[PDB]
Design an enzyme around this catalytic site. Sequence first.
Site, PDB file in Angstrom:
ATOM      1  N   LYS A 105      -5.479   0.905  -8.019  1.00  0.00           N
ATOM      2  CA  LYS A 105      -5.778  -0.228  -7.151  1.00  0.00           C
ATOM      3  C   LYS A 105      -6.918   0.169  -6.229  1.00  0.00           C
ATOM      4  CE  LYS A 105      -4.087  -4.445  -6.821  1.00  0.00           C
ATOM      5  NZ  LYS A 105      -3.920  -5.308  -8.023  1.00  0.00           N
ATOM      6  N   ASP A 145      -8.785  -9.465  -8.428  1.00  0.00           N
ATOM      7  CA  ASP A 145      -7.518  -9.776  -7.782  1.00  0.00           C
ATOM      8  C   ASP A 145      -7.789 -10.676  -6.589  1.00  0.00           C
ATOM      9  OD1 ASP A 145      -4.759  -9.771  -7.206  1.00  0.00           O
ATOM     10  OD2 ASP A 145      -4.589  -7.688  -7.874  1.00  0.00           O
TER      11      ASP A 145
END
Length: 419
Positions: A105, A145
């Site tokens: 991430k 995202d």
Amino acid sequence: MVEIDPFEMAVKQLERAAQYMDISEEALEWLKKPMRIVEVSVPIEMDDGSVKVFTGFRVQHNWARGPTKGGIRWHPAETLSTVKALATWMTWKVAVVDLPYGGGKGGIIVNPKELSEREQERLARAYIRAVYDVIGPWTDIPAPDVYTNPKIMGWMMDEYETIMRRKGPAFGVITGKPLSIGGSLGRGTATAQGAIFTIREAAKALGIDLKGKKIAVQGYGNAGYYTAKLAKEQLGMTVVAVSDSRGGIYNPDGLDPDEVLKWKREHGSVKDFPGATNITNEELLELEVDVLAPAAIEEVITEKNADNIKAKIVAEVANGPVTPEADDILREKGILQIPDFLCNAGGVTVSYFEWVQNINGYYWTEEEVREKLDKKMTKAFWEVYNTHKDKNIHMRDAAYVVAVSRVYQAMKDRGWVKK
């Protein structure tokens, strides 16, 4: 004394899955800390000729199975405990459908609604020049995202094609790009096609004739429209009730999932559809249909309405829309609920199918992507369901058994954990 850290919550759901498998003590403490955390200062130049410094991250959890893959979040309330919690979670999501990937991430502490369009270029490029030394086409692959879009991921690819001096496959450094720069097809119906195939096999597992069953869908986003659209044409189920943030409708003889979009863009919501019944989401959850699929916020089906569910297959299309207290009430009634990282794993299978295209250099069409996704989500369901038939655990815990058993077996063969 009331503190809920996101990274400690991801560790507690790993120690739950340590008891349903025979795993050593030395590999349990290996998976509880990410293997490389980079936190950089990302400077941009503003519109008035002044300089700011935003704080960026990059967390790579576990590259035992292959190159790590993970999105990019742009949010002002980003913390390192919230990036690492989605970094551990990405390892059990890319492994449950058997991809050669690891978890990751990245985040930047910024509010993107207060930056101009030129300043979003100077931030998306300056993020790449800070963490170029820990990413790459075979090392770490970003993705879109929350508060990112395909428009921004094209810019991060361009700054990588300037730094690398074009000595390598630069289109594979990032997935979720536009179509005319090296993107892939089937990314608009990506997530919702994943839930169609597992529903098609779960009704096979029960032995149910799907020709004429009824489906209620909570939420009507891009995932909620495309699940209800493909349920009539591919499967054949009678669409009976869809809903959104305003309320729900009802028709026991069928619905148009396409002309509803003609109303919802014209009107404010699907409220007051001709030949409908304006009911709430509360009555929609405890309806008597064949299959439920929430496309809405988390914790919609809870323990305060778990006993009143009249359905057979529950597809958790969202990111955890079912409370843990509602598992044991649902499990004994005769219902079969799909895990949160098994139903919507199509957004990672389609995003993996782009990276295969950019590495080779040969782009597939809409028929080849739909066919090779059809074999992936079929096999990953019969590894999860058959694991539930062997040791008799819930489908949430049974998917956690297959997800860690692949990563531990790849950690043992690389020589990292001896025992």
